[PDB]
Design a protein around this motif. Structure first.
Motif, mmCIF file in Angstrom:
data_model
loop_
_atom_site.group_PDB
_atom_site.id
_atom_site.type_symbol
_atom_site.label_atom_id
_atom_site.label_comp_id
_atom_site.label_asym_id
_atom_site.label_seq_id
_atom_site.Cartn_x
_atom_site.Cartn_y
_atom_site.Cartn_z
ATOM 1 N N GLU A 267 0.663 -1.324 -0.097
ATOM 2 C CA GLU A 267 -0.268 -0.032 -0.171
ATOM 3 C C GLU A 267 1.217 1.052 0.100
ATOM 4 O O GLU A 267 2.328 0.975 0.064
ATOM 5 N N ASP A 268 0.200 2.732 -0.477
ATOM 6 C CA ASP A 268 1.231 3.174 -0.291
ATOM 7 C C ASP A 268 0.352 4.947 0.722
ATOM 8 O O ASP A 268 -0.462 5.335 0.493
ATOM 9 N N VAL A 269 1.613 4.538 1.592
ATOM 10 C CA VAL A 269 1.253 5.855 3.110
ATOM 11 C C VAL A 269 1.405 7.085 2.573
ATOM 12 O O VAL A 269 1.994 7.643 3.520
ATOM 13 N N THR A 270 2.817 7.731 1.183
ATOM 14 C CA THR A 270 3.449 8.900 1.283
ATOM 15 C C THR A 270 2.026 10.007 1.197
ATOM 16 O O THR A 270 1.007 9.228 0.603
ATOM 17 N N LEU A 271 2.469 10.809 1.487
ATOM 18 C CA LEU A 271 1.748 12.004 1.144
ATOM 19 C C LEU A 271 2.093 13.154 0.517
ATOM 20 O O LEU A 271 3.479 13.231 0.499
ATOM 21 N N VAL A 272 0.618 13.450 -0.724
ATOM 22 C CA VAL A 272 1.721 15.022 -1.778
ATOM 23 C C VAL A 272 1.998 15.966 -0.740
ATOM 24 O O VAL A 272 0.198 16.227 0.320
ATOM 25 N N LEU A 273 2.268 17.214 -1.102
ATOM 26 C CA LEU A 273 2.638 18.011 -0.526
ATOM 27 C C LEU A 273 2.837 18.808 -1.884
ATOM 28 O O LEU A 273 2.888 18.849 -2.903
ATOM 29 N N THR A 274 2.111 19.828 -0.917
ATOM 30 C CA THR A 274 1.759 21.560 -2.061
ATOM 31 C C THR A 274 2.387 22.700 -1.181
ATOM 32 O O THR A 274 2.409 22.458 0.070
ATOM 33 N N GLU A 275 2.134 23.774 -1.735
ATOM 34 C CA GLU A 275 2.205 24.660 -0.831
ATOM 35 C C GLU A 275 0.669 24.792 0.224
ATOM 36 O O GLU A 275 1.032 25.641 1.510
ATOM 37 N N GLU A 276 -0.056 24.019 0.002
ATOM 38 C CA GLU A 276 -0.948 24.373 0.520
ATOM 39 C C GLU A 276 -1.401 23.671 1.665
ATOM 40 O O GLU A 276 -1.487 23.740 2.776
ATOM 41 N N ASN A 277 -0.427 22.765 2.053
ATOM 42 C CA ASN A 277 -0.211 21.433 3.188
ATOM 43 C C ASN A 277 1.386 21.462 3.798
ATOM 44 O O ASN A 277 1.287 20.324 4.738
ATOM 45 N N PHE A 278 2.472 22.177 2.799
ATOM 46 C CA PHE A 278 3.318 21.821 3.200
ATOM 47 C C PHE A 278 3.955 22.224 4.702
ATOM 48 O O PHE A 278 4.175 21.443 5.222
ATOM 49 N N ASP A 279 3.996 23.570 5.220
ATOM 50 C CA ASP A 279 3.937 24.174 6.366
ATOM 51 C C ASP A 279 3.360 22.975 7.518
ATOM 52 O O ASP A 279 3.865 22.447 8.299
ATOM 53 N N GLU A 280 2.454 23.151 7.487
ATOM 54 C CA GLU A 280 1.649 22.702 8.259
ATOM 55 C C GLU A 280 1.749 21.322 9.102
ATOM 56 O O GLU A 280 2.057 21.001 9.875
ATOM 57 N N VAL A 281 2.086 20.751 8.146
ATOM 58 C CA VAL A 281 3.012 19.520 8.063
ATOM 59 C C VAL A 281 4.750 19.578 8.365
ATOM 60 O O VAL A 281 4.575 18.595 9.260
ATOM 61 N N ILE A 282 5.089 19.513 8.099
ATOM 62 C CA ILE A 282 6.149 19.963 8.488
ATOM 63 C C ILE A 282 6.643 20.721 10.266
ATOM 64 O O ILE A 282 7.260 19.922 11.420
ATOM 65 N N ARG A 283 5.417 21.162 10.507
ATOM 66 C CA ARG A 283 5.545 22.351 12.066
ATOM 67 C C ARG A 283 5.162 21.228 12.648
ATOM 68 O O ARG A 283 5.299 21.879 14.082
ATOM 69 N N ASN A 284 3.869 20.561 12.492
ATOM 70 C CA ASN A 284 2.818 19.397 13.570
ATOM 71 C C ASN A 284 3.358 18.234 13.286
ATOM 72 O O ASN A 284 2.652 17.802 14.029
ATOM 73 N N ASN A 285 4.561 18.065 12.989
ATOM 74 C CA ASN A 285 4.910 15.653 12.867
ATOM 75 C C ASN A 285 6.578 16.127 13.415
ATOM 76 O O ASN A 285 7.238 17.197 12.425
#
Length: 106
Positions: free
Chosen positions: A1-19
């Motif tokens: 299965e694929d558990v990778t996550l697509v990142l764009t300017e829409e979620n880049f920062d929140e993902v990096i800051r909150n994980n």
């Protein structure tokens, strides 16, 4: 299965800051080395499912982000810990090196 996550300017920062640990495979479909690295990146992401985020940033659709982190060659795997970049790995990363890096930061 694929558990990778697509990142764009829409979620880049929140993902990096909150994980705690977030990896970002910067790729493009026309890139041969990227194509060979993808299954390895996906395989390791599955091994650490739920423990770290394995993002994917397609460089042609995210030029500004690629530029921000000076991604001149692909594939490139950015590594963020506690919201800050701790490494940037250029070229397809050996599976042992990739798993070793993840373990180190977790």
């Amino acid at each position: 299965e694929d558990v990778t996550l697509v990142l764009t300017e829409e979620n880049f920062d929140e993902v990096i800051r909150n994980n705690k640990l977030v990896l970002v495979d910067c790729w493009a479909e026309w890139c041969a080395p990227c194509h060979l690295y993808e299954p390895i990146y996906k395989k390791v992401a599955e091994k650490y499912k739920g423990k770290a985020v394995f993002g994917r940033l397609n460089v042609d659709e995210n030029q500004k982000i690629a530029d921000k982190y000076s991604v001149l060659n692909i594939p490139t795997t950015l590594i963020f810990v506690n919201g800050q970049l701790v490494d940037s790995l250029v070229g397809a990363v050996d599976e042992d090196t990739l798993e070793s890096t993840v373990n180190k930061y977790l």
